[PDB]
Design a protein around this nucleic acid. Structure first.
Ligand SMILES: [Zn+2]
Lengths: 326, 241, 219, 327, 320, 287, 280
RNA sequence: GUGAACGGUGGAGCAACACCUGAAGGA
């Protein structure tokens, strides 16, 4: 089906990468041993083949959001706001296993050797929701494919050929930030502010003596006051996202359009406390033709009617029969 | 035994089944054993089940199975010959490691048939050639047909023992797989590279897969001494009849 | 002429489980060129013996070609290659629901059938190949120039040949007895490597109906 | 006949390799026992000979796509985009054996070998589709020859002799991608979140208690859970690959069929990893016998081949497939 | 639940960025070696994508106030101005560990990876104050999302949504300020002065001898710092996900007395002084010259919520 | 608690500014280098956003006296005429290190890393003199908040949000003055820029949870400080100022004789002075 | 300590200001058109905030004599009329460096960056003359502050309004003279006010200031001595707000006079040599 | 008539929760 959606972030994007790195105070990453270093957390990165210079082509690092995360976010968006309201409005409810299978795509993580029937497969792959995301026991395949989120950068020239020959950026994209998390007690110096503490001055002095005891022991668990850093992506960038479906039902593409139309007020990857991942959708293209406007989708009338009809007929027997094993 | 099916004629005692047909005209070969069916011989039209999948191993497209081939196809002894060696004096089991050591180090001096099963139940007996010399053994292991020379196995084992002299714990110079399916099959470990000359490496590289598969069973720390296999011909005879 | 042929191939090829014979490759090439010449509907066995090679004669028939089996010089360690086969359940499901496939069974039978999945593994080697033969040179070089691959699993693309060379060699340096020979072969040709086995000495070496007792060495 | 297709991938390529591999948290792979490790799945890699800068040969790994996968994908594209629409339009319906023979090339029709005649052998080898892939109970030889997908890399210099002096990749072309499986129940945070399960708080609390009991059982036995952490290796996206196809004395209809299959081949996915949209690619060039025929809108040229394939596709019937499968 | 706060500052704003920097007499910063080089500190800075040429977007600097700093400021204003009176007047006293978990996320250096039953999660999430800040031993999620403080500058056109095309300012918005420190003993200048301190004139001469010895082989100092000029507009964005009315009321209550506090950095010279100009709540301005007009439902809900507050939830939250 | 001191200058005021600039004989803004250039010492300047044009806000310059100078003047006057009399009549004798700690903040660099205890922190925060400024080896926080002295000018309207709607100067408030030290260094011709006299400036001071004694001591300090020079220029006698008004927490208290109110603060600081011990400063600055 | 002395001029006062200004036949100053331009020299000037327009504050010009010249005049008259005859009597010659140090502050152009001992500062700040005017190689700070000379004008109300509500003149106080070198001067018969301050002074220093003020009337203020500009008379000297001036001199504050008599009785040239010496 | 010829390693699953760089410096 090949829907292409271009978005823009208005807060920094952060997606932790497994491992450990250290940064010196001035800002070199992975300094040689013998110099002071602080723990660092780096954002997700992929290597993409690109032309450095004129003709010589090397692998260059790029900043992207994993497609697993984006697919899971799309699922939760389309499921929390549409399936749950239209489901609980009736007396229909799911089992615990049905809920787990609907959300995580599986119930317990154990496949079943016994296969399923052809009619069951053909019926489940035509469901508005189950057909989009396969899984569960006796794993099936859905007809939704989700790609990663690529910023429109010169390093990604070979990934995307035409349509973006301009408004392509270059240069550094990430920035490092720091945090301390100080100890409140050491900030306490006034008696009228310690009346809440049980014991007051005696308890405070006991804790301070505990701190000196800890410091004496360590030089021979961890201090509240520290200093750490992590790296994020600068705001204001333009990202492109591509989603594909093979031979889809009109209800399925309608549901995808609904999820896109209500994609707002969402956090992409992480940094929820610090408000990372806020974004604004500013472009949607359906098979090459723009179908987005400042008010909304304002298109896909046949898809919208089909998805409305499908959700009106939605029920909870299919989810229970799909999630159940043996 | 010119043809494999001869086993049921000689090693065990059996006769033609009741309900078979008679052949006339130009002779044709058994689609399993590849032995010609002459005039007046007992044969059955090919009526294998839907689970049959060894069409690539069929020797002829005549769709006729001689009575010896039909007896070979019997289920009751299919699991009775999962790992066996058949000689003129009867059948023996090679499932035990010591039996494999005896077969691949001090083999019997008569023509025999060597079958080893890689699954619970599969047809192996009618598609393995019968060997006539003890220097070049034919072994059928699943969908694989291996040629094993016991002298090369003995030489490799002697080289391994020689290189393992002077060490407190036994170490295998080369990694081999019993299943014979891993990508590391037939590859020399770092220790073997460090304590063997390049000629040893070339010799170990230039052995046929049968030698590697046979060595995988015995070229390990717990060295098994050769031991004669167990005679199980009477159990097979009483199970079939 | 008592000449020798050497073949180098860029692509790694299948490791043969039995001896690969030069006369077999030449016969396959001759059959291919006969098909190219006399149309497609041609009996393979009418032309595969027409080769520019001499014939040895055993005391009782059993003539074999002078060409010997190929010898390998390994450049890389052997590596196992895995393949598998299976039929897609989903597409069959869609076709059966649409009536494009006539099937009445509720589900695939676990005991076997069309939908069973299979897996297999075979060795793979990259090497230098050498062979010795007695016969004319120009026909051999033309046939070899016609060839493009060598070994098994040619449809998948294994064993693409990079080049070949044919050169005359001295009579004492052209051992063609490293081959499959009849049981009654002269003991002068037979060496200690030869052993008694049931194999094919001529024609299609994969036809089990033509296998006979003979003397052959281990590959 | 020689067809060379040069393509460029947009998304990472992932072809599962059958082996047991473990990786640590950091970059180092296959750690010695004694440190925390996680299972890993790597792409298909083949060792090849290398002669660069000198005359001695070195063994070097190279990531490739197996030719069997490419052949099967081409067969599926040819069937789905050409054969099935025409057969449906005509109204002809295939049997189970014919369907299996056409799609899988299996001999699971008449299990026993099928004797044939040179007349019928020639007729099926002249068929536009059956002669291309052969197969069946008769095990007919195939007129189509498919190579593996080779990236344009320095390690691949032995496979390609010349003409690629430029666009040659160097250095590694693979990277490890991680994935964790979470537990949706542990993310519940309010009664409105649990208003969809059979029972409210009690069932979720029982799920917690069962999970904690299993956790204690694991912590006692060694001294299931949804959450997991694994990694898998993929080929970096964006690079260029070359593919080689050939035919042994083909008719014009088969060549036109191959061309049409390529024209619809741009739609398909190369390999597995459908959910992550892996295997996506575009065609950068098509050379037919050393002549460039690929253009912006498709294959401009080869008119006789297109007319031949149109004439062939205007006459397919299922009875040929049936009589080929059953004899 | 989106809150947009428009503020103005009356004094220089100084947030100390980590890192060593050097300054000469002129405006060049981090000079080539050999020039008169003195230590410097600069304001916190973030890189943003901007249309400097209006045809090409690249990364340009902009001075901001970190989101974590203002999150802590909001939490401290909420706690010390509301929670403490409610606990003291009800006779409820709080332990040290729960106090730390209130002030800080945890009472210990290393968190414990053990889950909690769902009923506990729901109860602690329904809490008015603990709901907003999820810092605890089990790493509970919070209901509050706080953003960094942004000036209204053309560098951040792509960040601000719309309607700011008129009041947006340009040009550099930062300055460098110099300061020096002198030794009092050198400025005695009188006999009675030196005799006032112990030792007298001989003591002053001995201290000068010690200073000479130190110079041959120390309170004089001179250094600069970079601050943001006063009198420019700043914007703050806060959001809440599915909150109860009590939590919104508590946020508004903390905001109503927010103007009194000082932004972090430069306490001794009164730097963090600011005046709140407007408060928009989902697109409706609800700020008056003295406080919030409207939203009485949240005010009544939080007024009910503060009644009945107990310390039991804190000790049942922060234990192990 | 906002203390507001409205002052005016009797003499022109001038504050030294870091850096060196050159100037021609008459004006000549941006001249070619090497044309009658003479060294100039520039007064301290601070940028501020201003509504120069309708809808546009520009960073314009302005002339201020920095807050650190006035905080130091506060401390010096306070330690000169208040605590010193109590030290001399009671018979106390501060140490040299304690004196340096009292006058210039920290006694020495490289402070002790280890903290001491809450008790002494509380005592020092409750001290009339130590609490207001703090310092010491433990980086003790202060109670005072000092703002720079801002002239009442139309540019600073965005700083003077409420009040002062009149008597807002409009024209330039500075002037360049020339001086030559001829032979009666020696024989030097120089220039210097100085703020014109007779214009109103405003001073903002704040405190957090202040005790009555500290407020009373600060209020004694302003009266003592009326006779002092805010900026350098003792030889030129520059900075003579007169305190016009004092507003305490937004309500006016100043009169011709002095402050009118706060006798409670005055008596509280008076009794706080009684019983003052030199031991406080001795232990506070000891590490 | 806070001495305020009013003065009257009997001749025009001239204090040339650096810069370039033009006049056109006395009609206008600095016209936009370059027609009939002539060079003009201006007297020193001082902008002051004043109340004009009855409610608004503006900057207006005010003619002054700079405080640097007044401080130098005080130094020179005190050094010539008082210190010099007492020093030269009974011997006590000064070195050339000490002479330069006493007349112009430093003796050289480069000051040494070293500090000075506490005893030297204590003894120098107590000297009747050295403690008054600081300076020297180590830049000692004196305790004398000299303001500039202001006319008692309605423009300077925000500077001195409280003291003089009446007796304030108004209007221009400048006249342009052609002798073709044209310059502007302040008209004679005007009343000026001069403010001098000392911080923590001894009685000897105040006595020395009063002695210098007695003999100052024979000197001249700025001006061109060839054109006999700058003559003045002294009246109305007030010490700490109290009137201590008579027609025959000060006649008041006798303790200062006794102290200065004793101090200048025992002055010696050793202190001058010690102060002027540079320990580079 | 290369011990040839026939055979797709594939489906499913979020890396993240909580954290103030600041205390004191010019006539
Ligand atoms: Zn048979």
């Amino acid at each position: 089906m090949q829907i292409e959606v271009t978005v823009r972030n208005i807060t920094p994007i952060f997606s932790a990468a497994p491992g450990s790195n250290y940064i010196t105070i001035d800002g070199t990453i992975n300094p040689p041993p013998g110099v002071s270093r602080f723990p660092l957390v780096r954002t997700r990165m992929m290597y993409v083949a690109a032309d450095v210079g004129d003709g010589v082509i090397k692998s260059v690092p790029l900043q992207i959001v994993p497609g697993n995360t984006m697919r899971s976010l799309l699922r939760r968006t389309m499921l929390k706001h549409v399936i749950e309201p239209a489901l609980v409005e009736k007396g229909n409810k799911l089992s615990i296993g049905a809920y787990a299978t609907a959300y995580s795509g599986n119930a317990t993580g154990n496949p079943d050797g016994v296969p399923s029937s052809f009619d069951e497969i053909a019926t489940m792959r035509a469901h508005p929701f189950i057909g989009l995301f396969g899984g569960g026991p006796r794993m099936l395949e859905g007809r939704l494919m989700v790609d990663s989120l690529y910023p429109i950068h010169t390093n990604a020239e070979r990934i995307l050929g035409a349509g973006y020959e301009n408004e392509m950026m270059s240069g550094p994209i990430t920035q490092v930030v720091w945090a301390r998390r100080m100890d409140p007690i050491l900030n306490l110096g006034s008696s009228e502010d310690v009346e809440v503490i049980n014991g007051g001055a005696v308890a405070a002095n006991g804790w301070i003596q505990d701190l000196l005891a800890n410091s004496k022991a360590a030089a021979s668990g961890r201090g509240l006051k520290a200093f750490n850093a992590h790296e994020v992506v600068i705001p204001g960038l333009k990202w492109v996202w591509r989603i594909s479906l093979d031979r889809p039902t009109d209800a399925q593409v309608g549901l995808v359009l609904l999820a896109l139309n209500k994609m707002t007020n969402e956090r992409i990857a992480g940094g929820h406390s610090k408000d990372y991942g806020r974004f604004v959708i500013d472009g949607v293209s359906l098979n090459g033709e723009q179908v987005w406007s400042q008010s909304g989708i304002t298109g896909g009338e046949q898809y919208f009617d089909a998805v409305a009809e499908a959700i009106d007929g939605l029920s909870s027997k299919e989810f229970e029969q799909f999630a159940q094993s043996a | 035994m010119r043809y494999p099916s001869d086993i049921v004629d000689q090693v065990l005692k059996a006769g033609p089944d009741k309900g078979l047909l008679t052949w006339e005209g130009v002779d044709a070969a058994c689609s399993h054993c590849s032995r010609p069916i002459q005039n007046g011989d007992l044969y059955s039209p090919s009526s294998v089940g839907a689970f049959f999948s060894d069409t690539r191993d069929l020797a002829s497209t005549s769709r006729s199975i001689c009575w010896r081939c039909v007896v070979l196809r019997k289920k009751p002894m299919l699991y009775g010959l999962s790992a066996a060696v058949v000689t003129q004096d009867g059948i023996y089991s090679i499932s035990k490691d010591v039996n494999k050591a005896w077969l691949f180090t001090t083999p019997p001096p008569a023509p025999f048939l060597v079958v080893h099963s890689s699954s619970t139940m599969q047809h192996l007996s009618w598609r393995t050639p019968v060997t006539l010399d003890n220097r070049r053994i034919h072994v059928r292991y699943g969908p694989n047909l291996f040629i094993v020379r016991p002298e090369v196995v003995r030489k490799a084992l002697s080289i391994a023992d020689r290189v393992n002299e002077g060490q407190k714990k036994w170490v295998t110079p080369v990694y081999f797989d019993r299943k014979a399916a891993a990508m590391g099959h037939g590859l020399i470990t770092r220790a073997g590279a460090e304590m063997l000359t390049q000629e040893e490496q070339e010799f170990f590289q230039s052995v046929t897969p049968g030698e590697r598969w046979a060595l995988s069973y015995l070229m390990h720390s717990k060295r098994p001494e050769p031991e004669v296999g167990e005679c199980i011909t009477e159990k097979v005879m009483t199970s079939l009849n | 002429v008592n000449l020798k042929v050497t073949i180098d191939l860029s692509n790694p090829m299948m490791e043969p489980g039995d001896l690969l014979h030069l006369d077999a490759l030449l016969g396959a090439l001759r059959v291919s060129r006969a098909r190219a010449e006399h149309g497609d509907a041609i009996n393979p066995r009418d032309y595969h013996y027409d080769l520019p090679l001499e014939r040895y004669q055993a005391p009782s028939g059993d003539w074999v070609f002078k060409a010997s089996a190929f010898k390998l010089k390994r450049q890389l360690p052997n590596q196992m290659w895995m393949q598998t086969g299976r039929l897609s359940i989903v597409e069959a499901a869609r076709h059966r629901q649409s009536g494009y496939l006539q099937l009445r069974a509720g589900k695939p039978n676990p005991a076997g059938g069309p939908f069973k999945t299979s897996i297999y593994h075979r060795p793979i080697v990259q090497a230098e190949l050498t062979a010795f033969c007695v016969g004319d040179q120009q026909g051999i070089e033309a046939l070899l120039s016609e060839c493009r691959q060598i070994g098994g699993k040619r449809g998948v693309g294994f064993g693409q040949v990079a080049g070949f060379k044919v050169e005359p060699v001295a009579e004492t340096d052209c051992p063609w007895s490293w081959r499959a020979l009849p049981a009654d072969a002269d003991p002068r040709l037979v060496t200690s490597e030869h052993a008694r086995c049931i194999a094919a000495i001529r024609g299609p070496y994969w036809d089990r109906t033509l296998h006979v007792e003979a003397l052959a060495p281990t590959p």
